[PDB]
Amino acid sequence: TDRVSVGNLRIARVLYDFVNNEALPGTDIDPDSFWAGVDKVVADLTPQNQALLNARDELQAQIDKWHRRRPIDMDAYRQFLTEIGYLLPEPDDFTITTSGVDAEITTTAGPQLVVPVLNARFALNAANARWGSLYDALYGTDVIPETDGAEKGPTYNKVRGDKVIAYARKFLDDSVPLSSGSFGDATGFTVQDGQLVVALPDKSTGLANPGQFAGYTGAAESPTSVLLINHGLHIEILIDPESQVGTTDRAGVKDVILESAITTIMDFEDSVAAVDAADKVLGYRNWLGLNKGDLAARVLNRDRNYTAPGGGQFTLPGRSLMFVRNVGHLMTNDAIVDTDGSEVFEGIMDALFTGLIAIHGLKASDINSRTGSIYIVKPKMHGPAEVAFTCELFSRVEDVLGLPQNTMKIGIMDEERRTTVNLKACIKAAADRVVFINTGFLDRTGDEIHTSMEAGPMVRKGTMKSQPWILAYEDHNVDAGLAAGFSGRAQVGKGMWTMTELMADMVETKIAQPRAGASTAWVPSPTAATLHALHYHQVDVAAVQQGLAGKRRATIEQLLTIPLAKELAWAPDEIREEVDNNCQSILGYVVRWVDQGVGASKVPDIHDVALMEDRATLRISSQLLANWLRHGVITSADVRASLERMAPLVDRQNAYRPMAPNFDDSIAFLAAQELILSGAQQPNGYTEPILHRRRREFKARAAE
Ligand SMILES: O=C(O)c1ccc2cc[nH]c2c1
Ligand SMILES: [Mg+2]
């Protein structure tokens, strides 16, 4: 074949070439020593990797049987979980020791943006989303109602623009209050004796807290902009009477700029579809362009220059601080196969290659962490041993890369049940590497359903968000983080807002996350990060965290409360709706995944709301239907009929290729069907083995 032999490994030429010609040059790592390291690391860690996955299966089988032989005793269930080593002892209190971590992670609370690394233009916008226009975010979304008069048109609408301006003035009043009066009545800004002075019609005033004045641009006498800081986040008022908006403005203001996406996660996992060496290389190459600072379509932003209150000069980061999300322990990829032809573990490969590439970001670029850290998000881990394994992998990789030990820092996803109930030990296992924990609530619900598949029928998918287990899971995660001393040291993060068009709703409800003590939470786009930034100005996360300290708000019993439905909880019509809804979302996502290699896309649901979502929402839907089928809530004819019914709608909702009417001939349709009908047999309900196989199948058919 077209592979390169190195030890026991056979590396796809496209990857070998990528590494030698693009990734390695500029790192000072000897190419031959690198490849020897890859061979050695894969050979050494592969057995432990496999045994961990086998252990998952064995635990699940025991729980499966336990439920089959079962009016539901929690004392018994809990002592059984401890017996089989599912529930492990909680360690004594400790504080994490992770050092050399940047301020964007240790200290600054704010939005965290996640983007598919395979999409270069998306990744570019994400990195540039550290600063974003509040006016654009308000004007373009439904935050400002399109009520009579204020509708978006083909051209600028002055009625709407004025509501945007008023909305921002109120934000300023709430965030950076004047000693007296309102920003709404401002006519000018000036800096005098190093102090911000605001002109109102009748008199002048300063800030109630002059500590919020951070800097300015242009002459102090008539600044071209004024820079404020609040709860550690910057706000920049652009002052330009010459501009169109500025002309209509009372103080010549052109825009309000928010520091928005403080950090960004470049994603190789659930938001992308990458099933072979060509796909991985595309991803790795974008990740390289990001770290080298030369990725272009439009290019990456430079730092920002300001004059300090006093009159000196300083600078602020122009770009979002980058994490990379590697895949988890489950999958293999044929990017590399061994002599026997066995595919190599993809997570192992990601650590080596994304780690290698990240070195560039530590270096002056013809730039990322100034403290010398590399930030890797690791998803879908089940328990402390799997966490320890990930740390051992990073340690071995650091050795191959000639990096100081603990350079490679870990963002722990809390998105599997065996991690949730052992969270303190999982953190302890990574106490010198961990830079965040985060509630991946969607995968977590998929795992919740699969783990208790045999217990009985589960509540409807929309009911899950408010079940006792998930509310406890959220509080427990924050409690464990704070108890491990995350305050001032590491992020406590919460989940993604998936309704991309419902920004009014996001601004209304997503404030609950910072109020819950989360120093960060996930947004889908630059625009959403700007709007989500508002919440951090309203909530004092540091204070909230201090108030939460030492609280223990979720019991193990609460964590373990299985979301079983009550006897006969559903009328026939509600059942049908749940089925159609789930089939619709499965089909809408899968069709783009299998046909176009698109791992994340705005997909209208049944009620026709635009949902982003990724692989995890597929995991939830397939497991729920698999659970209902397993326990006789629905029949196989129900599933099939629903799939055939929703298919044409999906086709219609959509370079596309219709699934209907020849379903048995549609690879996408059959993948969706397989996900449901084989759902119960997928390891932890994971959708990758099926998706990957079907996408490779589609690629092979397209080729001929
Ligand atoms: O981190 C994820 O699982 C996730 C979820 C939704 C979206 C939409 C774009 N990127 C995503 C990532
Ligand atoms: Mg997830």
XYZ file of C-alpha atoms and ligand atoms in Angstrom:
717
model
C 0.000 0.000 0.000
C 0.841 3.708 0.384
C 2.160 3.461 3.940
C 5.517 4.164 5.558
C 7.088 1.566 7.849
C 8.483 2.662 11.213
C 8.954 -0.072 13.790
C 5.687 -1.990 14.123
C 3.661 0.844 12.579
C 2.533 1.538 9.018
C 1.794 5.250 8.624
C -0.377 6.707 5.876
C 1.926 8.600 3.520
C -0.260 11.735 3.678
C 0.255 11.900 7.445
C 3.952 10.986 7.376
C 4.544 13.742 4.800
C 2.407 16.237 6.726
C 4.394 15.673 9.899
C 7.859 15.772 8.270
C 7.291 18.747 5.973
C 4.827 20.919 7.943
C 4.610 19.904 11.594
C 8.213 19.052 12.504
C 10.178 21.900 10.901
C 10.732 24.673 13.441
C 10.398 22.547 16.578
C 14.018 21.338 16.852
C 12.750 17.766 17.311
C 14.752 15.150 15.417
C 12.345 13.653 12.855
C 13.653 10.102 13.325
C 13.512 10.301 17.112
C 9.967 11.614 16.819
C 8.818 8.646 14.768
C 10.614 6.210 17.076
C 8.788 7.871 19.954
C 5.417 7.399 18.221
C 6.160 3.681 17.703
C 7.317 3.274 21.314
C 4.410 5.203 22.856
C 1.798 3.343 20.799
C 3.332 -0.038 21.592
C 3.615 0.784 25.322
C 0.202 2.340 26.016
C -2.070 0.428 23.641
C -2.643 -2.552 25.997
C -3.741 -0.305 28.900
C -5.960 1.637 26.510
C -7.685 -1.597 25.433
C -8.058 -2.882 28.993
C -9.741 0.359 30.054
C -12.279 -0.028 27.245
C -12.795 -3.689 28.188
C -13.427 -2.638 31.788
C -16.141 -0.268 30.583
C -17.882 -3.186 28.892
C -17.550 -5.463 31.931
C -19.020 -2.905 34.342
C -21.924 -2.165 31.997
C -22.664 -5.891 31.635
C -22.829 -6.294 35.435
C -25.134 -3.305 35.835
C -27.267 -4.635 32.951
C -27.664 -7.988 34.712
C -28.203 -6.390 38.120
C -31.251 -4.520 36.775
C -32.599 -7.567 34.945
C -32.849 -9.477 38.216
C -34.445 -6.606 40.131
C -39.243 -1.493 43.230
C -35.927 0.084 43.595
C -33.507 -0.034 46.510
C -30.917 2.762 46.403
C -28.990 1.488 49.445
C -28.578 -1.819 47.612
C -27.785 -0.255 44.224
C -25.116 1.941 45.779
C -23.394 -0.862 47.678
C -23.450 -2.923 44.483
C -21.737 -0.126 42.520
C -19.040 0.020 45.212
C -18.653 -3.730 45.150
C -17.855 -3.874 41.427
C -15.518 -0.892 41.622
C -17.839 1.437 39.722
C -18.179 3.745 42.712
C -14.745 4.295 44.270
C -13.763 5.820 47.608
C -13.561 9.595 47.703
C -10.022 10.865 48.578
C -9.297 13.350 51.360
C -9.502 17.044 50.528
C -6.631 18.409 48.437
C -5.767 21.537 46.432
C -4.635 21.334 42.783
C -1.018 22.288 42.007
C -1.239 23.057 38.259
C 1.164 25.919 37.465
C 2.325 27.990 34.498
C -1.271 28.561 33.448
C -2.346 31.746 31.646
C -4.648 34.381 33.184
C -7.453 33.666 30.708
C -7.867 30.323 32.503
C -6.824 30.897 36.131
C -8.506 34.212 36.684
C -10.708 35.648 33.937
C -14.343 34.549 33.929
C -16.038 34.700 30.518
C -17.350 32.903 27.399
C -15.574 29.888 25.924
C -16.157 29.274 22.233
C -16.047 25.793 20.657
C -15.476 25.402 16.897
C -14.833 22.490 14.428
C -11.124 22.583 13.662
C -11.780 21.184 10.154
C -13.497 24.436 9.207
C -10.703 26.940 8.641
C -12.936 30.011 8.313
C -14.842 29.131 11.495
C -11.563 28.554 13.385
C -10.210 31.876 12.135
C -13.309 33.771 13.302
C -13.153 31.965 16.646
C -9.533 32.966 17.346
C -10.448 36.515 16.339
C -13.530 36.490 18.602
C -11.658 37.768 21.687
C -13.106 41.134 20.687
C -16.513 41.524 19.052
C -19.016 44.275 18.232
C -21.957 44.508 20.660
C -23.906 46.615 18.148
C -23.563 43.970 15.448
C -24.544 41.265 17.908
C -27.709 43.161 18.952
C -28.706 44.409 15.520
C -28.281 41.068 13.803
C -30.069 38.882 16.326
C -33.474 38.790 17.977
C -32.157 40.364 21.192
C -33.739 43.539 19.811
C -37.303 42.549 18.866
C -38.229 43.059 15.207
C -41.485 44.561 16.495
C -43.261 46.994 14.196
C -40.758 49.588 12.965
C -37.569 47.848 14.054
C -37.471 45.071 11.460
C -34.190 44.150 9.791
C -34.257 45.127 6.139
C -32.018 44.954 3.079
C -30.531 48.231 4.360
C -29.802 49.835 7.754
C -32.912 50.580 9.817
C -32.600 53.701 11.999
C -35.440 52.685 14.331
C -33.693 49.386 15.019
C -30.246 50.976 15.265
C -31.553 53.388 17.888
C -32.868 50.518 20.026
C -29.448 48.872 19.710
C -27.797 52.105 20.889
C -30.185 52.448 23.836
C -29.658 48.805 24.780
C -25.885 49.380 24.905
C -26.195 52.626 26.919
C -28.191 50.768 29.573
C -25.529 48.048 29.601
C -22.924 50.747 30.314
C -25.064 52.228 33.089
C -25.376 48.762 34.659
C -21.743 47.774 34.196
C -19.660 50.918 34.654
C -21.980 53.388 36.460
C -21.291 57.151 36.332
C -21.139 58.978 39.686
C -24.383 60.672 38.654
C -26.463 60.606 35.468
C -26.662 58.130 32.602
C -24.443 57.237 29.666
C -27.653 57.677 27.714
C -27.235 61.415 28.242
C -23.517 61.600 27.472
C -22.293 64.146 24.926
C -18.570 63.566 25.285
C -15.623 61.773 26.831
C -12.261 63.199 27.909
C -9.276 62.177 30.037
C -7.976 64.715 32.524
C -5.382 64.163 35.231
C -5.568 60.478 34.308
C -9.296 60.361 34.977
C -12.295 59.608 32.773
C -14.629 62.586 32.626
C -18.066 62.217 31.059
C -19.966 65.235 29.726
C -23.712 65.407 30.388
C -25.861 68.313 29.098
C -26.023 70.209 32.414
C -22.701 69.180 33.970
C -19.897 66.595 33.952
C -19.244 63.445 35.971
C -16.796 60.595 36.550
C -17.149 56.859 37.180
C -18.644 55.718 40.471
C -15.628 53.403 40.515
C -12.736 55.159 38.694
C -10.902 51.843 39.017
C -12.937 50.738 35.990
C -11.202 53.194 33.679
C -8.460 51.089 32.054
C -7.204 53.188 29.174
C -7.988 54.988 25.942
C -6.823 55.640 22.395
C -6.120 58.933 20.612
C -5.587 62.280 22.359
C -6.635 62.388 26.002
C -8.476 65.627 25.185
C -10.758 63.914 22.665
C -10.151 60.142 22.725
C -10.860 57.972 19.697
C -11.949 55.373 22.258
C -12.346 54.700 25.961
C -11.428 51.429 27.603
C -13.179 50.137 30.674
C -12.699 46.999 32.684
C -15.361 45.262 34.749
C -15.103 41.925 36.530
C -11.849 41.522 34.612
C -13.436 41.919 31.180
C -12.811 44.858 28.842
C -15.408 47.156 27.309
C -14.379 49.551 24.595
C -16.458 52.540 23.545
C -15.581 53.546 19.993
C -15.814 57.297 19.600
C -16.151 58.394 16.014
C -18.549 61.232 15.088
C -17.423 60.805 11.469
C -19.090 57.390 11.158
C -22.672 56.766 10.022
C -23.909 55.496 13.383
C -21.679 58.017 15.124
C -23.369 60.855 13.234
C -26.760 60.026 14.757
C -25.278 59.367 18.204
C -25.520 61.931 21.012
C -21.847 61.505 21.981
C -20.542 60.518 18.557
C -20.338 56.870 19.656
C -19.893 54.390 16.795
C -19.973 51.038 18.658
C -19.378 49.263 21.911
C -16.801 46.464 21.656
C -16.859 43.600 24.143
C -13.999 41.314 25.076
C -15.968 38.129 24.334
C -14.429 34.706 23.665
C -11.638 34.790 26.250
C -10.671 31.215 25.344
C -11.555 29.006 22.380
C -11.562 25.236 21.956
C -10.407 24.032 18.531
C -12.303 20.776 18.250
C -11.187 17.448 16.766
C -14.044 15.504 18.404
C -17.860 15.784 18.342
C -18.253 18.798 16.035
C -16.129 17.287 13.233
C -16.302 14.271 10.945
C -12.863 12.776 10.349
C -12.676 9.105 9.513
C -9.310 8.522 7.863
C -5.834 10.003 7.396
C -6.911 12.616 4.860
C -9.499 14.066 7.290
C -7.130 14.071 10.279
C -4.419 15.792 8.218
C -6.866 18.558 7.203
C -7.626 19.091 10.873
C -3.996 18.933 11.973
C -3.047 21.385 9.233
C -5.584 23.991 10.384
C -4.406 23.519 13.955
C -0.861 24.135 12.609
C -1.827 27.350 10.792
C -3.448 28.571 14.007
C -0.362 27.950 16.108
C 2.034 29.348 13.473
C -0.241 32.365 13.196
C -0.457 32.151 9.406
C -3.788 30.420 8.789
C -5.614 32.537 6.213
C -8.731 32.704 4.017
C -8.759 37.302 6.082
C -6.150 36.566 8.756
C -5.469 36.419 12.508
C -5.606 39.576 14.644
C -2.675 41.268 16.356
C -2.622 42.558 19.934
C -4.314 45.887 20.755
C -2.480 49.099 21.738
C -3.770 51.413 24.465
C -2.683 54.452 26.414
C -3.028 53.976 30.170
C -5.002 56.346 32.420
C -1.638 57.889 33.376
C -0.460 58.306 29.793
C 1.967 55.414 29.375
C 1.463 52.634 26.820
C 0.309 49.041 27.174
C -1.141 46.212 25.109
C -3.923 43.620 25.327
C -4.164 40.170 23.643
C -5.983 40.407 20.319
C -6.796 36.708 20.098
C -8.733 34.081 22.017
C -6.458 31.751 24.003
C -6.578 28.346 22.289
C -7.277 24.904 23.751
C -7.463 21.876 21.441
C -10.015 19.097 22.013
C -8.544 15.666 21.278
C -10.738 12.617 20.804
C -11.254 10.263 23.771
C -10.087 6.694 24.448
C -12.568 4.743 22.312
C -11.813 5.046 18.627
C -9.054 3.854 16.335
C -8.193 5.465 12.996
C -6.404 3.946 9.988
C -4.137 6.972 9.751
C -1.779 4.436 11.303
C -2.122 0.643 11.330
C 0.258 -1.931 12.828
C 1.796 -4.881 10.999
C -1.307 -6.975 11.646
C -3.303 -4.210 9.967
C -4.929 -3.185 13.256
C -5.807 0.515 13.409
C -4.024 2.603 16.047
C -5.882 4.375 18.905
C -6.874 7.870 17.741
C -6.614 9.518 21.165
C -3.010 8.336 21.410
C -2.299 9.835 17.986
C -4.023 13.140 18.828
C -1.853 13.663 21.903
C 1.312 13.126 19.830
C 0.319 15.188 16.797
C -1.720 18.037 18.361
C 0.970 18.197 21.046
C 3.728 18.415 18.434
C 1.846 21.116 16.543
C 1.093 23.144 19.668
C 4.817 23.740 20.154
C 4.662 26.326 17.368
C 2.200 28.389 19.411
C 4.786 28.716 22.163
C 7.113 30.468 19.741
C 7.373 33.839 18.035
C 5.477 33.279 14.807
C 6.631 34.480 11.414
C 1.355 32.953 19.299
C -0.641 31.292 22.150
C 0.475 30.561 25.776
C 3.043 33.062 27.122
C 3.427 30.964 30.270
C 4.545 27.946 28.230
C 1.535 25.618 28.561
C -0.313 23.514 25.979
C -4.052 23.121 26.635
C -5.762 19.865 25.728
C -9.431 19.115 26.343
C -10.008 15.382 26.894
C -13.612 14.193 26.412
C -15.588 11.067 27.312
C -13.428 9.676 30.119
C -14.981 7.176 32.525
C -13.481 7.480 35.992
C -10.110 8.180 37.688
C -8.094 5.346 36.120
C -8.962 6.684 32.664
C -7.874 10.137 33.812
C -4.574 8.796 35.201
C -4.075 7.032 31.864
C -4.547 10.306 29.969
C -1.969 12.015 32.195
C 0.503 9.179 31.677
C -0.014 9.588 27.912
C 0.722 13.308 28.103
C 3.836 12.595 30.199
C 5.105 10.055 27.642
C 4.323 12.472 24.801
C 6.174 15.330 26.560
C 9.175 12.995 26.710
C 8.943 12.325 22.982
C 8.595 16.064 22.288
C 11.399 17.131 24.629
C 8.988 19.315 26.583
C 9.123 19.911 30.329
C 6.906 17.532 32.275
C 3.366 18.884 32.822
C 3.579 21.249 29.831
C 0.491 19.547 28.426
C -2.428 20.652 30.571
C -5.798 18.896 30.686
C -9.363 20.157 30.515
C -11.447 17.376 32.024
C -14.913 16.887 30.559
C -17.374 15.644 33.207
C -19.737 14.008 30.743
C -19.878 10.331 31.747
C -21.563 8.937 34.881
C -18.547 7.005 36.195
C -16.619 10.307 36.078
C -19.468 12.269 37.747
C -19.728 9.959 40.781
C -15.919 9.779 41.109
C -15.237 13.401 40.199
C -12.993 14.308 43.149
C -10.660 11.357 42.441
C -10.672 12.176 38.704
C -9.447 15.690 39.536
C -6.916 14.320 42.019
C -5.570 12.022 39.311
C -4.736 15.152 37.279
C -3.985 17.552 40.174
C -0.812 18.959 38.567
C -2.233 19.153 35.019
C -5.899 20.116 35.286
C -6.938 23.555 33.945
C -10.675 22.914 33.878
C -13.627 20.688 34.555
C -16.820 21.070 32.583
C -20.312 19.591 32.533
C -20.781 18.122 29.078
C -24.483 17.711 29.884
C -25.557 16.254 26.511
C -23.093 13.332 26.436
C -23.826 12.955 30.122
C -27.506 12.320 29.353
C -26.559 9.779 26.674
C -24.431 7.956 29.236
C -27.232 8.203 31.834
C -29.635 6.410 29.494
C -27.197 3.739 28.338
C -25.979 2.925 31.836
C -29.530 2.311 33.085
C -30.867 0.916 29.782
C -32.162 -2.233 31.491
C -33.890 -0.570 34.470
C -36.960 0.547 32.522
C -38.313 3.235 30.173
C -36.693 6.678 30.569
C -38.418 10.055 30.647
C -38.711 12.021 27.426
C -35.608 13.806 26.140
C -36.976 17.281 26.941
C -37.772 16.143 30.502
C -34.130 15.141 31.123
C -32.878 18.740 31.530
C -34.873 19.088 34.755
C -34.469 15.634 36.276
C -32.933 15.397 39.783
C -29.833 13.497 38.596
C -28.798 16.272 36.207
C -29.416 19.169 38.584
C -27.286 17.354 41.196
C -24.645 16.617 38.560
C -24.359 20.332 37.773
C -23.999 21.443 41.416
C -21.705 18.508 42.313
C -19.303 19.505 39.550
C -19.016 23.075 40.805
C -18.675 21.860 44.417
C -15.845 19.441 43.575
C -13.995 22.053 41.559
C -14.157 24.726 44.263
C -13.195 22.215 46.945
C -10.145 21.333 44.844
C -9.279 25.023 44.835
C -10.253 25.884 41.277
C -11.044 29.442 42.349
C -8.146 31.498 40.991
C -6.463 28.446 39.450
C -8.714 26.697 36.909
C -12.010 27.010 35.057
C -15.307 25.609 36.267
C -17.266 25.352 33.029
C -20.819 24.603 31.935
C -22.545 23.499 28.734
C -23.311 24.689 25.199
C -26.236 26.876 24.148
C -27.497 25.111 21.002
C -30.332 27.391 19.813
C -28.397 29.642 17.455
C -31.280 31.907 16.464
C -32.759 32.250 19.954
C -30.385 34.928 21.273
C -33.033 36.832 23.222
C -33.702 33.522 24.969
C -29.986 32.916 25.493
C -29.470 36.339 27.055
C -32.506 35.726 29.275
C -31.682 32.262 30.567
C -27.955 31.449 30.156
C -27.146 33.924 32.979
C -27.958 30.995 35.273
C -24.523 29.479 34.539
C -22.307 32.251 35.942
C -24.863 32.611 38.762
C -24.150 28.956 39.519
C -20.462 29.796 39.968
C -19.215 28.752 36.529
C -16.188 30.775 35.481
C -16.919 29.814 31.877
C -19.599 28.324 29.624
C -19.888 27.244 26.003
C -21.206 29.267 23.106
C -21.527 28.235 19.426
C -20.313 31.371 17.630
C -18.522 34.751 17.968
C -21.887 36.498 18.090
C -23.089 34.301 20.935
C -19.856 34.914 22.873
C -20.451 38.678 22.670
C -23.992 38.344 23.984
C -22.953 35.794 26.609
C -20.243 38.277 27.711
C -23.089 40.462 29.071
C -23.774 37.880 31.767
C -20.252 38.134 33.217
C -20.650 41.894 33.599
C -23.859 41.367 35.566
C -22.683 38.479 37.726
C -19.618 38.657 39.987
C -18.423 35.079 39.437
C -15.485 35.409 41.851
C -17.850 36.545 44.588
C -20.322 33.807 43.693
C -17.546 31.226 43.935
C -16.382 32.566 47.297
C -19.920 32.273 48.623
C -20.255 28.677 47.429
C -17.079 27.570 49.211
C -17.196 24.402 51.288
C -20.831 23.789 50.390
C -21.843 20.225 49.619
C -25.075 20.548 47.696
C -25.448 17.150 46.001
C -25.498 13.703 47.577
C -24.334 10.486 45.958
C -27.970 9.330 46.234
C -29.032 12.399 44.271
C -26.377 11.726 41.607
C -27.609 8.128 41.222
C -31.306 8.888 40.800
C -32.207 7.150 37.541
C -34.575 9.148 35.293
C -37.146 6.339 34.854
C -40.598 7.368 33.644
C -43.654 6.831 35.834
C -46.057 4.029 35.000
C -48.139 4.886 31.929
C -46.874 8.482 31.894
C -47.652 9.178 28.224
C -50.681 9.399 25.981
C -50.353 7.722 22.575
C -49.929 11.104 20.852
C -47.095 12.257 23.109
C -45.215 9.028 22.419
C -45.552 9.485 18.668
C -44.277 13.033 19.009
C -41.215 11.977 20.985
C -40.474 9.298 18.378
C -40.855 11.632 15.386
C -38.847 14.285 17.143
C -35.960 11.969 17.877
C -35.965 10.383 14.402
C -36.059 13.830 12.829
C -33.006 15.060 14.695
C -31.091 11.813 14.140
C -31.780 11.880 10.387
C -31.112 15.619 9.986
C -27.705 15.344 11.646
C -26.615 11.966 10.222
C -27.447 12.838 6.605
C -24.960 15.726 6.607
C -22.430 13.676 8.604
C -22.512 10.670 6.295
C -22.983 12.490 2.965
C -20.820 15.594 3.426
C -18.434 14.940 6.327
C -20.103 17.720 8.310
C -20.002 17.083 12.047
C -21.975 20.110 13.199
C -24.716 22.102 11.485
C -27.814 24.192 12.196
C -30.567 21.562 11.930
C -34.207 22.596 12.332
C -35.949 20.242 14.743
C -39.603 19.218 14.430
C -41.018 22.510 15.722
C -38.563 23.947 13.207
C -36.200 25.654 15.678
C -32.601 25.843 14.484
C -30.450 23.617 16.675
C -26.693 23.328 16.324
C -25.712 20.321 18.400
C -23.140 17.649 17.562
C -22.525 13.920 17.966
C -23.711 13.982 21.578
C -27.251 14.986 20.607
C -27.208 11.978 18.339
C -26.130 9.828 21.303
C -29.072 11.065 23.391
C -31.698 10.559 20.666
C -30.599 7.102 19.552
C -30.263 5.827 23.134
C -33.696 7.145 24.128
C -35.386 5.446 21.174
C -33.300 2.310 21.767
C -34.499 2.401 25.394
C -38.167 2.822 24.434
C -37.939 -0.017 21.913
C -36.118 -2.182 24.482
C -38.936 -1.804 26.993
C -41.867 -1.958 24.584
C -42.994 1.682 24.622
C -42.802 1.618 20.825
C -42.589 -1.183 18.232
C -40.100 -1.762 15.427
C -42.777 -0.758 12.944
C -43.168 2.503 14.864
C -39.483 3.300 14.487
C -39.382 2.385 10.824
C -42.551 4.313 10.032
C -41.288 7.362 11.887
C -37.939 7.213 10.056
C -39.669 6.981 6.646
C -41.982 9.835 7.623
C -39.280 12.198 8.849
C -36.850 11.391 6.033
C -38.629 13.391 3.282
C -39.020 16.334 5.630
C -35.279 16.320 6.297
C -34.689 16.103 2.531
C -36.975 19.100 2.155
C -35.382 21.048 5.000
C -32.176 20.745 2.930
C -25.105 19.675 -3.109
C -27.580 17.480 -1.224
C -28.764 13.903 -1.925
C -32.338 12.884 -0.936
C -32.818 9.846 1.326
C -36.367 9.158 0.142
C -37.915 7.240 -1.411
C -35.248 4.565 -1.845
C -34.349 4.257 1.847
C -32.713 0.835 1.622
C -30.310 2.332 -0.910
C -29.393 5.327 1.284
C -26.245 4.954 3.381
C -27.272 7.918 5.528
C -30.769 6.502 6.106
C -29.367 3.070 7.044
C -26.867 4.671 9.430
C -29.696 6.474 11.230
C -31.646 3.228 11.394
C -28.625 1.306 12.622
C -27.970 3.855 15.363
C -31.437 3.159 16.786
C -31.871 -0.585 16.164
C -28.316 -1.376 17.303
C -28.200 1.397 19.906
C -28.439 -0.894 22.913
C -25.316 -2.801 21.802
C -23.081 0.219 21.216
C -20.418 0.675 23.927
C -21.850 3.289 26.333
C -24.229 4.290 23.542
C -21.344 5.835 21.558
C -22.300 6.670 17.963
C -18.788 6.833 16.480
C -18.307 3.191 15.545
C -21.424 3.310 13.349
C -21.009 6.850 12.006
C -17.374 6.242 11.096
C -18.098 2.961 9.306
C -21.018 4.480 7.349
C -19.088 7.625 6.352
C -16.147 5.531 5.145
C -18.728 3.451 3.259
C -20.138 6.587 1.648
C -16.660 7.772 0.686
C -15.924 4.423 -0.929
C -19.165 4.486 -2.914
C -18.606 8.056 -4.056
C -15.137 7.091 -5.297
C -16.432 4.504 -7.795
O -18.460 20.512 22.654
C -19.512 20.055 21.915
O -19.831 18.901 22.248
C -20.135 20.948 20.890
C -21.546 21.076 20.831
C -22.186 21.870 19.883
C -21.440 22.579 18.938
C -21.738 23.478 17.838
C -20.531 23.857 17.274
N -19.478 23.246 17.956
C -19.998 22.457 18.991
C -19.358 21.652 19.966
Mg -19.508 15.852 24.727
